[PDB]
Design an enzyme around this catalytic site. Structure first.
Site, short mmCIF file in Angstrom:
data_model
loop_
_atom_site.label_atom_id
_atom_site.label_comp_id
_atom_site.label_asym_id
_atom_site.label_seq_id
_atom_site.Cartn_x
_atom_site.Cartn_y
_atom_site.Cartn_z
N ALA A 1 17.52 -19.97 8.43
CA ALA A 1 17.54 -21.43 8.24
C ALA A 1 18.96 -22.05 8.36
O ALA A 1 19.14 -23.26 8.43
CB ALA A 1 17.01 -21.78 6.85
N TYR B 1 9.54 -18.11 3.17
CA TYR B 1 10.09 -19.40 2.77
C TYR B 1 10.30 -20.26 3.99
O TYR B 1 10.35 -19.76 5.12
CB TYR B 1 11.40 -19.23 1.98
CG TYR B 1 12.56 -18.61 2.75
CD1 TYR B 1 12.65 -17.22 2.86
CD2 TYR B 1 13.54 -19.43 3.33
CE1 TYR B 1 13.74 -16.64 3.51
CE2 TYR B 1 14.64 -18.85 3.96
CZ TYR B 1 14.75 -17.45 4.05
OH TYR B 1 15.83 -16.89 4.64
N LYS C 1 20.06 0.58 13.93
CA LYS C 1 18.69 0.97 13.68
C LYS C 1 18.38 1.08 12.17
O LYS C 1 17.99 2.14 11.68
CB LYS C 1 18.40 2.30 14.39
CG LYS C 1 17.87 2.18 15.81
CD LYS C 1 16.39 1.74 15.83
CE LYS C 1 15.77 1.71 17.27
NZ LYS C 1 15.48 3.05 17.93
N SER D 1 17.27 4.46 9.06
CA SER D 1 15.91 4.87 9.45
C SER D 1 15.66 6.37 9.28
O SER D 1 14.51 6.82 9.15
CB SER D 1 15.65 4.50 10.89
OG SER D 1 15.95 3.15 11.10
N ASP E 1 19.54 -11.37 5.13
CA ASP E 1 18.67 -12.48 5.52
C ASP E 1 17.92 -12.10 6.81
O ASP E 1 18.48 -11.40 7.66
CB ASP E 1 19.49 -13.74 5.80
CG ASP E 1 18.68 -14.79 6.57
OD1 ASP E 1 17.98 -15.60 5.94
OD2 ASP E 1 18.69 -14.76 7.81
N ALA F 1 -19.05 4.10 18.82
CA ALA F 1 -20.06 5.09 19.17
C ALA F 1 -19.76 6.49 18.68
O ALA F 1 -20.69 7.18 18.28
CB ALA F 1 -20.34 5.09 20.67
O1 LIG Z 1 -18.23 5.10 21.11
C1 LIG Z 1 -17.59 4.14 21.52
O2 LIG Z 1 -18.08 3.05 21.83
C2 LIG Z 1 -16.12 4.31 21.70
O3 LIG Z 1 -15.67 5.47 21.42
O4 LIG Z 1 -15.59 3.30 22.21
O1 LIG Z 2 19.70 -17.15 4.96
C1 LIG Z 2 19.95 -18.23 5.55
O2 LIG Z 2 21.06 -18.77 5.95
C2 LIG Z 2 18.74 -19.10 5.70
O3 LIG Z 2 17.67 -18.63 5.27
O4 LIG Z 2 18.88 -20.19 6.23
FE LIG Z 3 -16.99 1.56 22.27
FE LIG Z 4 17.76 -16.91 4.46
#
Ligand SMILES: O=C([O-])C(=O)[O-]
Ligand SMILES: O=C([O-])C(=O)[O-]
Ligand SMILES: [Fe+3]
Ligand SMILES: [Fe+3]
Length: 689
Positions: free
Chosen positions: A123, A92, A73, A259, A60, A465
């Protein structure tokens, strides 16, 4: 060549069983193999996944949060899609369901018995409790939130709540001996549905659940009329008016994975086949989004339409959003910390030098302004989206990205324009700037039509630019998306460090950080783009006319600049013609939109206020300008804002990026995208879908 099995994590017997049913039918359909591990709570699975014992689990929003925190992580791989009563959704509404004929409103829950999904859930806890913090009369972090809630609710069932220390928290929970108040389906009051039995079996007076839980249990509209919804405006509305009567809108449950080496794609392969084979009435042999009645929402959310793969830059924070993130981080901060943050403004500074100036701005503002930083502009914008920073001035090019992600332009830069530099500025209509192609008067051979294979300097990729204006014009005459092949070698910070685009770049002083899209790269920016042209490392530079003017004729004194003279330079006109720098009005590639400051439409007003003060103090005519700080200056490094900005003006009505940038340019930016897109621009399409 062969690729292994996903170890799915289960929290209780029933769930283990369904998981087994799942593994079974999966192999029977000669699709991706699954494995089913067994822990006793999602909190345990997060640990199990992080320590490479499991690989996936549905979680959740609230637990997605916990999962993405340091030691673990984890990251959301796929999001369940839902009912909506309309168009399917990955969001939701959390709500508080109550029986008809109980009288109390939202601001009167003190002393009531409450039923909750589980400790830690959107929730079932994060949303209602955060909403009720103001009535909790609770210190903040040092004092256990639980010691606060337990004192408010006369008795409740909050699965996973430390019923040992806070027995009032587990009191209403049914469940045998040690089964009581378990963090799984063991405890019969666990989840959207237990929170409803605990309510319906008259064990509690209010239930904090999902917008559909009622209908999931009461198929007959008669049953329903016996219930109502606590509105955040102290009124009660029928269970079907959740679009109007809701505590909040949280993001959907998600399948999380590690990850680093999390086997995301094995996981997605599995889920993709599972939906297709057992999702919405595909089969009967096994139903993925269906469970038993004793226990519900097993493995996944019963009646989910399916899943959507979540892009890859997306981490928990971006996934959850500023709004959800804040409230969740809020239950872990004191009222003072919270209050503090809401009043200051956190600027996002890009790279090392912008941060120093940001620090000065901070001290000199007595911390009305605080700072945050990132190496790249997209990183700042992401900070702006997780809600860690509040604003940053951006170039047309990125105003577009910011906009595609839902941030709006607050105020725009107004260079020291020319008519009447009286108070006009803040109300002066932004007049843009002329983007130009610059070449030395020497190489008189060189023209627009002979740019092919020559060397080029660019402010950066993604910017008006430089990138967006020429590249859009060239891609036109050449019909090819091979951008790194048009110019021989080039410097365009932000490009692939291994591509020709990063070839002419130089990195910082001891030549490291080559090509980085920030000030570290000496050739980044309108200035760096010009230096490039000037240190003879490039043949053509794409900047705005003025850039020439501000670095030639002694104006800039840096060794390289010093001796330049506007005379040594010319402008490549579209019709092949060549005009001196000063001729720019009759020889520009285009007229771009001034950079502009952007923020969530939420903070825009506050943000405007502080900015109007700050600039009044240290602005173009700021009294403490040379004195103690000049917001609009930095020795040509154009840090934080351009060095020729008089003030930050009003948008003259142009309040959306499309209006701000205008039709053409917005269009012109999309055509180019045919060639390229970005992980942010990609991450945001999903997040704003
Ligand atoms: O050309 C531009 O304006 C830039 O690079 O921000
Ligand atoms: O998952 C939960 O408990 C919720 O969404 O309220
Ligand atoms: Fe610019
Ligand atoms: Fe939930």
């Amino acid at each position: 060549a062969p690729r292994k099995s996903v170890r799915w994590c289960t929290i209780s017997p029933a769930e283990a069983a369904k998981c087994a049913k799942f593994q079974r039918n999966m192999k029977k359909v000669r699709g991706p193999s699954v494995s089913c591990i067994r822990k006793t709570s999602s909190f345990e699975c997060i640990q199990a996944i992080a320590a490479n014992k499991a690989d996936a689990v549905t979680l959740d929003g609230g637990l997605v949060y916990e999962a993405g925190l340091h030691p673990y992580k984890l990251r959301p791989v796929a999001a369940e899609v839902y009912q909506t009563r309309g168009k399917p959704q990955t969001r939701y509404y959390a709500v508080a369901v109550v029986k008809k004929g109980s009288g109390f409103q939202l601001n009167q829950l003190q002393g009531v018995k409450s039923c909750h999904t589980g400790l830690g859930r959107s929730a079932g806890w994060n949303i209602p409790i955060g909403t009720l913090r103001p009535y909790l009369n609770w210190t903040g972090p040092p004092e256990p939130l639980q010691k606060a809630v337990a004192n408010f609710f006369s008795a409740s069932c909050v699965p996973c709540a430390d019923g040992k220390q806070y027995p009032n928290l587990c009191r209403l929970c049914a469940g045998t001996e040690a089964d009581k108040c378990a963090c799984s389906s063991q405890e019969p009051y666990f989840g959207y549905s237990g929170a409803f039995k605990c309510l319906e079996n008259g064990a509690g007076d209010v239930a904090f659940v999902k917008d559909s839980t009622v209908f999931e249990n009461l198929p007959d509209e008669a049953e329903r009329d016996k219930y109502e919804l606590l509105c955040p405006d102290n009124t009660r509305k029928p269970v079907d008016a959740f679009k109007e009567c809701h505590l909040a809108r949280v993001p959907s449950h998600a399948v999380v994975a590690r990850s680093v080496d999390g086997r995301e794609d094995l996981i997605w392969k599995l889920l993709h086949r599972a939906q297709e084979e057992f999702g919405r009435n595909k089969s009967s042999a096994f139903q993925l989004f269906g469970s038993t009645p004793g226990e519900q929402d097993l493995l996944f959310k019963d009646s989910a339409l399916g899943f959507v793969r979540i892009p890859s830059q997306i981490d928990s924070g971006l996934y959850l959003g500023a709004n959800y993130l804040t409230a969740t981080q809020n239950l872990r901060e004191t009222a003072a910390e919270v209050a503090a943050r809401r009043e200051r403004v956190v600027w996002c500074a890009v790279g090392p030098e912008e941060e120093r100036k940001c620090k000065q701005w901070s001290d000199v503002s007595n911390r009305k302004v605080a700072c945050a930083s990132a190496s790249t502009t997209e990183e700042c914008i992401a900070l702006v989206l997780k809600g860690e920073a509040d604003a940053l001035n951006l170039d047309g090019g990125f105003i577009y990205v910011a906009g595609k992600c839902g941030l709006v332009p607050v105020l725009a830069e107004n260079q020291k324009s020319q008519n009447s530099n009286a108070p006009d500025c803040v109300h002066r209509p932004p007049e843009g700037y002329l983007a130009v192609a610059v070449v030395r008067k020497s190489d008189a051979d060189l023209t627009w039509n002979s740019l092919s294979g020559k060397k080029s300097c660019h402010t950066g990729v993604g910017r008006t630019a430089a990138w967006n204006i020429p590249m859009g014009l060239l891609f036109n005459q050449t019909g090819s998306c091979k951008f790194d092949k048009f110019f021989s070698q080039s410097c365009a910070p932000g490009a692939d460090p291994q591509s020709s685009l990063c070839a002419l770049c130089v990195g910082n002083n001891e030549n490291e950080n080559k090509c980085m899209p920030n000030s570290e790269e000496r050739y980044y920016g309108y200035t760096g783009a010009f230096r490039c042209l000037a240190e003879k490392a490039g043949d053509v530079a794409f900047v705005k006319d003025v850039t020439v003017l501000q670095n030639t004729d002694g104006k800039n004194s840096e060794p390289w600049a010093k001796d330049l003279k506007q005379e040594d330079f010319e402008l490549l006109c579209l019709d092949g013609t060549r005009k001196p720098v000063a001729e720019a009005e009759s020889c520009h590639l285009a007229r771009a939109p001034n950079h502009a400051v952007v923020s969530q439409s939420d903070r825009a007003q506050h943000l405007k206020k502080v900015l109007f003060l700050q600039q009044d103090q240290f602005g173009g005519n700021g009294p403490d300008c040379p004195g103690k700080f000049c917001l609009f200056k930095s020795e040509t490094k154009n840090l934080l804002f351009n060095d020729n900005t008089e003030c930050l003006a009003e948008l003259q009505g142009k309040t959306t990026y499309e209006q701000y940038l205008g039709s053409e340019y917005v269009t012109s930016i999309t055509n180019l995208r045919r060639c390229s897109s970005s992980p942010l621009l990609e991450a945001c399409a999903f997040l704003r879908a």
